Amino acid sequence: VRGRHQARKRAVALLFEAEVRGISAAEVVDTRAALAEAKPDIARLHPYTAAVARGVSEHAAHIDDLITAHLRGWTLDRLPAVDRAILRVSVWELLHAADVPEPVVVDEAVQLAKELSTDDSPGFVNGVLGQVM
Amino acid sequence: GRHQARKRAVALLFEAEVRGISAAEVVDTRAALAEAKPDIARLHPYTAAVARGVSEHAAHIDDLITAHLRGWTLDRLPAVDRAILRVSVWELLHAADVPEPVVVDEAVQLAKELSTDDSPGFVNGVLGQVM
């Protein structure tokens, strides 16, 4: 585990919450920032979680178009919510996190899929992201 | 309004598991914030009851699920499916006002909306044996 693996995993949970509530991930980040200021001992918000989730919101249509273009016939709505969240996090990093090597971005997506999703999800996300990059 | 309350409980359990904190502690800090900040919305009371309930009865809930997984472990399921089964087994045990078949329907529908194509049939099978 890479230094920011947990921050990425918390960003996947924030994107999932946003989709359940029908609100932007940036709005969920604002709430998490308030919680961190209120209870810094038990509810820290990693700065990278906030940057990833805010970033996905700021670039939502472009990220979704790039994913859809590499889904070989599928629509984004057909994916399981956790795989959609992992791909949105990863595509934001490919576009806007120049310090993270592209192979590292994909390997992190593969590790998130292993930890949170199905056993065929790692190969799926590697395939999609390998084409996006 | 309970379907959306159940969806918010699945999301809360997933975030709690990622954070490594009990779902009751997530509820308690989120509820305290909404009492102090007018701009931050309160949780539906049923979301809070479900999430505190799963924490209170975690060992029993996980044992009942594991007894009907046929050798599979609960920790190896997709995280959203583990959260949906914990919410649903809690309702079978402690939400006496909700008919058992309605609990199963809600879980199958949460699986369809939030998880995999195979998840609805999987949760229907496990819960059909738990009830």
Side-chain angles (χ1 to χ4, degrees):
Chain A
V1 294
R2 300 221 175 70
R4 291 177 298 172
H5 186 73
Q6 180 69 8
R8 292 180 182 91
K9 195 189 293 204
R10 182 95 169 286
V12 170
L14 296 199
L15 265 66
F16 183 65
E17 169 74 14
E19 196 170 71
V20 161
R21 289 191 61 197
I23 60 175
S24 72
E27 180 165 342
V28 176
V29 174
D30 288 334
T31 295
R32 298 296 171 287
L35 205 81
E37 283 186 29
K39 295 271 241 160
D41 51 326
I42 47 172
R44 294 171 54 89
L45 168 68
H46 194 288
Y48 201 53
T49 298
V52 166
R54 281 186 173 134
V56 170
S57 282
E58 184 189 358
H59 303 286
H62 191 210
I63 290 165
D64 279 3
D65 182 70
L66 288 173
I67 294 162
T68 296
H70 294 283
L71 281 179
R72 301 180 227 175
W74 281 26
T75 49
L76 204 41
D77 77 314
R78 293 232 183 152
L79 305 189
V82 67
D83 295 334
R84 171 164 56 253
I86 287 164
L87 295 168
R88 287 171 163 164
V89 166
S90 294
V91 177
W92 178 81
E93 289 197 284
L94 292 177
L95 296 168
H96 300 289
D99 65 296
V100 187
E102 293 179 1
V104 170
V105 171
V106 179
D107 188 57
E108 284 292 283
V110 165
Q111 296 300 313
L112 295 161
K114 285 178 170 193
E115 292 165 353
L116 306 173
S117 192
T118 55
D119 55 14
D120 53 344
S121 186
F124 167 76
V125 298
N126 183 65
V128 173
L129 298 166
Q131 309 295 3
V132 175
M133 70 178 274
Chain B
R2 281 203 277 197
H3 186 70
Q4 181 62 18
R6 298 180 175 90
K7 263 208 212 155
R8 290 286 300 279
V10 169
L12 194 157
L13 266 60
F14 180 107
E15 192 170 356
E17 183 174 68
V18 169
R19 293 178 54 199
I21 288 123
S22 77
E25 184 166 354
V26 178
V27 173
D28 271 274
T29 58
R30 177 76 175 63
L33 180 73
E35 289 309 312
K37 264 77 188 150
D39 315 325
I40 293 170
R42 285 182 174 85
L43 294 176
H44 188 289
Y46 199 61
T47 298
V50 169
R52 288 182 172 120
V54 167
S55 284
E56 179 181 356
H57 297 108
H60 187 196
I61 289 165
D62 284 2
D63 188 60
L64 190 53
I65 295 159
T66 297
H68 299 101
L69 283 183
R70 292 174 194 211
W72 274 12
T73 69
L74 185 50
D75 46 71
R76 287 175 184 190
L77 299 192
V80 175
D81 290 351
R82 169 165 60 257
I84 290 165
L85 291 165
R86 287 170 163 164
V87 165
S88 297
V89 174
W90 176 84
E91 288 197 278
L92 291 176
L93 295 169
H94 297 290
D97 61 292
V98 184
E100 290 166 39
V102 172
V103 174
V104 177
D105 285 336
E106 288 290 307
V108 170
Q109 182 69 13
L110 289 168
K112 189 157 178 194
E113 290 169 341
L114 304 175
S115 197
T116 79
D117 287 347
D118 286 357
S119 292
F122 186 86
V123 304
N124 184 64
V126 172
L127 296 171
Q129 296 311 293
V130 171
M131 10 122 50

